[PDB]
Design an enzyme around this catalytic site. Structure first.
Site, mmCIF file in Angstrom:
data_model
loop_
_atom_site.group_PDB
_atom_site.id
_atom_site.type_symbol
_atom_site.label_atom_id
_atom_site.label_comp_id
_atom_site.label_asym_id
_atom_site.label_seq_id
_atom_site.Cartn_x
_atom_site.Cartn_y
_atom_site.Cartn_z
ATOM 1 N N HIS A 142 0.833 -1.202 0.000
ATOM 2 C CA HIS A 142 0.000 0.000 0.000
ATOM 3 C C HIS A 142 0.874 1.261 0.000
ATOM 4 O O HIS A 142 0.435 2.346 -0.426
ATOM 5 C CB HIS A 142 -1.017 -0.020 1.147
ATOM 6 C CG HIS A 142 -0.487 0.503 2.451
ATOM 7 N ND1 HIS A 142 0.020 -0.324 3.431
ATOM 8 C CD2 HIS A 142 -0.389 1.763 2.939
ATOM 9 C CE1 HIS A 142 0.385 0.402 4.478
ATOM 10 N NE2 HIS A 142 0.161 1.672 4.200
ATOM 11 N N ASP A 149 -0.420 -7.326 1.709
ATOM 12 C CA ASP A 149 0.213 -6.047 1.805
ATOM 13 C C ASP A 149 1.746 -6.208 1.898
ATOM 14 O O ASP A 149 2.327 -6.074 2.976
ATOM 15 C CB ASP A 149 -0.365 -5.230 2.971
ATOM 16 C CG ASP A 149 -0.013 -3.767 2.876
ATOM 17 O OD1 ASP A 149 0.534 -3.344 1.833
ATOM 18 O OD2 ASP A 149 -0.237 -3.023 3.846
ATOM 19 N N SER A 189 4.161 2.541 8.522
ATOM 20 C CA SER A 189 3.770 1.556 7.514
ATOM 21 C C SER A 189 4.891 1.126 6.604
ATOM 22 O O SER A 189 5.682 1.954 6.152
ATOM 23 C CB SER A 189 2.647 2.121 6.659
ATOM 24 O OG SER A 189 1.542 2.330 7.496
ATOM 25 N N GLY A 190 4.939 -0.178 6.333
ATOM 26 C CA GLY A 190 5.994 -0.725 5.491
ATOM 27 C C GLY A 190 7.232 -1.118 6.314
ATOM 28 O O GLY A 190 8.092 -1.860 5.846
#
Ligand SMILES: CN1Cc2nc(C(=O)N[C@@H]3C[C@@H](C(=O)N(C)C)CC[C@@H]3NC(=O)c3cc4ccc(Cl)cc4cn3)sc2C1
Ligand SMILES: [Ca+2]
Ligand SMILES: [Ca+2]
Lengths: 233, 54
Positions: A42, A88, A185-186
């Site tokens: 994402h 994801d 995120s990530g």
């Protein structure tokens, strides 16, 4: 990261920061080897063009060890779904190889069965990043880390307004105010086993940050170890 | 009751697999299994999963 502690010198060396054209971080990644970064699919939607910074602990000053790498190939899981954030996961091949040094080193990829029976049954893992320090706050200029308990899949499913697939797991606290947050995120979720740190998750999503009755949701790296292997060729 | 890999990771430093009825240890890339067949030795600088001290 809400709560937790700064990453001190040498402590979070596999952390990568994805940075946009304005040189601002918008997502984390985990260093897997001199050419490959693991991140969240994402995240790729969050910037048209981006680079990867490694070695950084304080975005407000040049401590000398920081290096920016261009991305050569983006390998996004073909089954990524924006509506549930299922699958994801993305791997990035860099144009030039990362130089390992103080604050720059890869996290280990574990073997699947061993990771599921032995790492993911540990009490806690560690999440890190440059993300917001509270739900409605700004990103952290300091790299932070946080010990997060693994959460029972049943409890997590009960707690969630959105489907928790088998490619996801939950970590964090019911009410204690510590969690990853937007901007993390990530980034890495790693699990320590005898002083060696193994990649176990990718920071993925949450209903807010550190909300009561809510947990952090991570991509289950063990579901993708073959896919990661293939992607790194 | 805890046996083999379920008893303290089979004494392995890292990966433990149960083969026939015995523990087999192995290591992440960039490490080599030691002579005792249990410990993992980094084969070069900056082995994976180690916090950096220099
Ligand atoms: C699958 N969907 C993704 C998703 N995102 C949701 C959400 O509340 N996100 C909010 C509001 C919007 C902008 C991002 C924002 N996300 C975060 O603050 C946020 C919080 C997090 C907490 C723990 C972990 Cl592991 C990862 C996180 C990632 N992002 S609810 C939901 C369900
Ligand atoms: Ca810096
Ligand atoms: Ca909570």
């Amino acid at each position: 990261i809400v709560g937790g502690q700064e990453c001190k010198d040498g402590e979070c060396p596999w952390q990568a920061l994805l940075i946009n054209e304005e040189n601002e971080g918008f997502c984390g990644g985990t260093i897997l080897s001199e050419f490959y970064i693991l991140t969240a699919a994402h995240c790729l939607y969050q910037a048209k063009r981006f680079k990867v910074r490694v070695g950084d602990r304080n975005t407000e000053q040049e401590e000398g060890g920081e290096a920016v790498h261009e991305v050569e190939v983006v390998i996004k899981h073909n089954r990524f779904t924006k509506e549930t954030y299922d699958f994801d996961i993305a791997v990035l091949r860099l144009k030039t190889p990362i130089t390992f040094r103080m604050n720059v080193a890869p996290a280990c990829l574990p073997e699947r069965d061993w990771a599921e029976s032995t790492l993911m049954t540990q009490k806690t893992g560690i999440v890190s990043g440059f993300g917001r320090t509270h739900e409605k706050g700004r990103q952290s200029t300091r790299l932070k880390m946080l010990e997060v308990p693994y959460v029972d899949r049943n409890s997590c499913k009960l707690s969630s307004s959105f489907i928790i697939t088998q490619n996801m797991f939950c970590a964090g606290y019911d009410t204690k105010q510590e969690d990853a947050c937007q901007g993390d995120s990530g980034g890495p979720h790693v699990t320590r086993f005898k002083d060696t740190y193994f990649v176990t998750g990718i920071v993925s999503w949450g209903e807010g940050c550190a909300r009561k009755g809510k947990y952090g949701i991570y991509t289950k790296v063990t579901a993708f170890l073959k896919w990661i292997d293939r992607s790194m060729k | 009751t805890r046996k083999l890999c379920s008893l303290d990771n089979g004494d392995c430093d890292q990966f433990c697999h149960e083969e026939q009825n015995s523990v087999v240890c192995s290591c992440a890339r960039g490490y080599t299994l030691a002579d005792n067949g249990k410990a993992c030795i980094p084969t070069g600088p900056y082995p994976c999963g180690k916090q950096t001290l220099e």
